Design a protein around this ligand. Sequence first.
Ligand code: 4HY
Length: 264
Amino acid sequence: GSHMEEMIRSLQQRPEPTPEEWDLIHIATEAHRSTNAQGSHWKQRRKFLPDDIGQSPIVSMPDGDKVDLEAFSEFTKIITPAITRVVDFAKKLPMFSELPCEDQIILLKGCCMEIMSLRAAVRYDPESDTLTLSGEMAVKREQLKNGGLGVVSDAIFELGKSLSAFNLDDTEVALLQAVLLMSTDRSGLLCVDKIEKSQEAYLLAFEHYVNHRKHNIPHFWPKLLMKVTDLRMIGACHASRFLHMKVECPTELFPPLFLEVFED
Ligand SMILES: O=C(O)Cc1cc(I)c(Oc2ccc(O)c(I)c2)c(I)c1
């Protein structure tokens, strides 16, 4: 192109975001930052879930990983704000908020656990080997496992540990969320084509933003896509396990919003 353009683009050749993609990137990034509990100040003012909690699984589950009701209660007491923040994030993306209300509900139920799991995973702390839930509650593998998640907890920790080396920034987390949200692998959607077109726009903007960032680890983009796949598997194991939870435990132990999201 122009001399200046060429000068500016010398150390690049992989496609950068277009100006339209930068707009999309900026809105998603801000939507995430404004809905992500604690402004990058999470590790300072976080508290550990007491070591004596989450050591006593005694409610049976079909897969044999039992549940500690006390730990389950501690986790579910803070889950309502966590789900609400995912909803707030989604409502801030124009391509989501212009969908029929019914499609918005289906998309949210479809991705809620995928996004929450990703938000917990990016707060993995290698030193203490904990996840920080909602940026306030540091939990150990055993505690999160026994408090209801079973093997889903091991999957989240594994993801969190592997994501450490990716050094994701807010934009990359935000775009993963948008890609998870705008999925047509749900049933009963009306605006299938429009949702797909939106996902494709986010995916391309995401690939181009990845080029822009020039991460030091190789094969970054396909590596990141593989993490999207892991997150969707985490979502599915959670949906399966939630069904069993509901068979074993009375409704009064589940906050209303938690039941609503993970319904069918
Ligand atoms: O980290 C925050 O932003 C969000 C965060 C908050 C919660 I509480 C959550 O922990 C869960 C999730 C599902 C579940 O059935 C049980 I029992 C515990 C996840 I993992 C992530």
